[PDB]
Amino acid sequence: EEEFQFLRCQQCQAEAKCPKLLPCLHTLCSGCLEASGMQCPICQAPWPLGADTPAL
Ligand SMILES: [Zn+2]
Ligand SMILES: [Zn+2]
């Protein structure tokens, strides 16, 4: 467990208020979905999948 129970945008590298699991198995923040219109920034590199869940 960690001192904090929150997520972190893998594309913004900051606190995610309302992050979501993109259709490409990626983790983005709320603002990213609205701003990036559900884009695919994490698709920039073949990152290791298998871990993608919402915030507590
Ligand atoms: Zn973001
Ligand atoms: Zn992608």
Swiss-Prot record:
The protein in question is named Protein PML
**Compartments where located:** Nucleus; Nucleus, Nucleoplasm; Cytoplasm; Nucleus, PML body
Q: Give cross-link positions for Glycyl lysine isopeptide (Lys-Gly) (interchain with G-Cter in SUMO2).
A: 17
Gene name in the database record: PML
Q: What does this protein do?
A: Functions via its association with PML-nuclear bodies (PML-NBs) in a wide range of important cellular processes, including tumor suppression, transcriptional regulation, apoptosis, senescence, DNA damage response, and viral defense mechanisms. Acts as the scaffold of PML-NBs allowing other proteins to shuttle in and out, a process which is regulated by SUMO-mediated modifications and interactions. Inhibits EIF4E-mediated mRNA nuclear export by reducing EIF4E affinity for the 5' 7-methylguanosine (m7G) cap of target mRNAs.
Q: Which residues cross the membrane?
A: none
In the record's own words, the domains note is:
The coiled-coil domain mediates a strong homo/multidimerization activity essential for core assembly of PML-NBs. Interacts with PKM via its coiled-coil domain. The B box-type zinc binding domain and the coiled-coil domain mediate its interaction with PIAS1.
Residue sites binding Zn(2+) 2 per the record: 24, 26, 40, 43
Cross-link Glycyl lysine isopeptide (Lys-Gly) (interchain with G-Cter in SUMO1), where in sequence? 17
The record lists the effect of residue 20 to R as: No effect on sumoylation levels
The positions annotated for binding Zn(2+) 1 are 9, 12, 29, 32
* Swiss-Prot/TrEMBL induction comment: By interferons alpha, beta and gamma. Up-regulated by IRF3 and p53/TP53.
PTM info: Ubiquitinated; mediated by RNF4, RNF111, UHRF1, UBE3A/E6AP, BCR(KLHL20) E3 ubiquitin ligase complex E3 ligase complex, SIAH1 or SIAH2 and leading to subsequent proteasomal degradation.
Complex formation:
Key component of PML bodies. PML bodies are formed by the interaction of PML homodimers (via SUMO-binding motif) with sumoylated PML, leading to the assembly of higher oligomers. Several types of PML bodies have been observed. PML bodies can form hollow spheres that can sequester target proteins inside. Interacts (via SUMO-binding motif) with sumoylated proteins. Interacts (via C-terminus) with p53/TP53. Recruits p53/TP53 and CHEK2 into PML bodies, which promotes p53/TP53 phosphorylation at 'Ser-20' and prevents its proteasomal degradation.
What disease does the Swiss-Prot or TrEMBL record associate with this chain?
A: A chromosomal aberration involving PML may be a cause of acute promyelocytic leukemia (APL). Translocation t(15;17)(q21;q21) with RARA. The PML breakpoints (type A and type B) lie on either side of an alternatively spliced exon.
First and last residues of each zinc finger (RING-type): 9-44
Effect in UniProt of substituting residue 12 to S: Strongly reduced sumoylation
